[PDB]
């Protein structure tokens, strides 16, 4: 079951985060119990020891690449760009989070300018919603419908992922399993 979530070759960007529908599996937990050292396995809700006793039917598996110093915004209840615009996690969260350093997999010497996030937006995200729209978006008096210019901004930017950086700026691959019956 836990084959294409962890050991895949490509992870989509934050503003177009992936979403699986794993179902009709058995446990596939003796694998991540042996995951060590997978940086952080700070899961929330049910205890990690008591995982082979529940009967989840819709085990989700999100996945993306973010900066290391921004994985803290995945915890239920936070403030930030990735907590308000890109991906939302409700306060009453009932699921686990797994994160690990993936510098050796996605860090080009020139720079992988192929990871995107929305810097600006007028209205914060609702729980469990996508933000795939890329329309021009502005704040002011000029409607500037489609027409670019001042006060009308394009809400996309790219990550400067490089090998010879710090741990905080180094990419981290985060997979959150929002367990839900």
């Amino acid at each position, epitope marked *: 079951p836990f084959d294409e979530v962890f050991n895949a070759t490509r992870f989509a960007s934050v503003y177009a985060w992936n979403r699986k529908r794993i179902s009709n599996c058995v446990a596939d937990y003796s694998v991540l119990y*042996n995951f*060590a*050292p997978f940086f952080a396995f*700070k899961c929330y*809700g*049910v*205890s*990690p*020891t*008591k995982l082979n006793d529940l009967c989840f039917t819709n085990v989700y598996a999100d996945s993306f690449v973010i900066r290391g110093n921004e994985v803290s915004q995945i915890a239920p209840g936070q403030t930030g760009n990735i907590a308000d615009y890109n991906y939302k996690l409700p306060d009453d969260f009932t699921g686990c989070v797994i994160a690990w350093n993936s510098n050796k997999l996605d860090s080009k010497v020139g720079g992988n300018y192929n990871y995107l996030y929305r810097l600006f937006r007028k209205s914060n995200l609702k729980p469990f919603e996508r933000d795939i729209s890329t329309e021009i978006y502005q704040a002011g008096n000029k409607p500037c419908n489609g027409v670019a210019g001042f006060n009308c901004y394009f809400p996309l930017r790219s990550y400067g992922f490089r090998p010879t950086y710090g741990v905080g700026h180094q990419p981290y691959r985060v997979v959150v399993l929002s367990f839900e019956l």
Partner: antibody
Amino acid sequence: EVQLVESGGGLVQPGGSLRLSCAASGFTFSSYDMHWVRQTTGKGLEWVSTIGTAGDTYYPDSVKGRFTISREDAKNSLYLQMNSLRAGDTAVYYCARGDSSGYYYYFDYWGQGTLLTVS
Amino acid sequence: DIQMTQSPSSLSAAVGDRVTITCRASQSIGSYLNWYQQKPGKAPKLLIYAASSLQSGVPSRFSGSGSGTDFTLTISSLQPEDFAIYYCQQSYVSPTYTFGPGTKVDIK
């Protein structure tokens, strides 16, 4: 109904290793977890480490790597091998027992505590 | 990461009272609480879990309820064997378990 004891604690020299021997009996030791809680006289209680019935060494941020949990199911024992004992780890170490009601986690009947002076 | 708190630490009450100790937590927790009683010298002992449940051997006087970011256990018929400190706990964050600060209920 489970009686827990601990042994092996001592005023060992700094930087050495030490083996707590909580051991104990009265329960199916191969069915429940058993944790350790550090009781410093001033800063309350903090959870040292834990082990499950899968060989899964879950560790806190500071304790990770510098410690080691070891579950021997043949004879009752759970070693807590020290590594590079810091001068701040002068507290009482209780071995506890886990429990649950499906979702929530409770620290069930504790035992007693030895003393580490890290000196 | 939840820094849960309480500070009616220096509680004072003579033998026999109905004083109430309140434990109010940080960023939203929900119904995640379990209680402990600690005698001096002896070992910590858990009394009430889920903030409203019962464990065998725990007298009914240590009753209480509550949910969300608010918690309460009512202590009726105070007795000399209700000495020393008391402890909260959260269980929303699974690996790094947190423990309550501490409150002392005395005899005077």
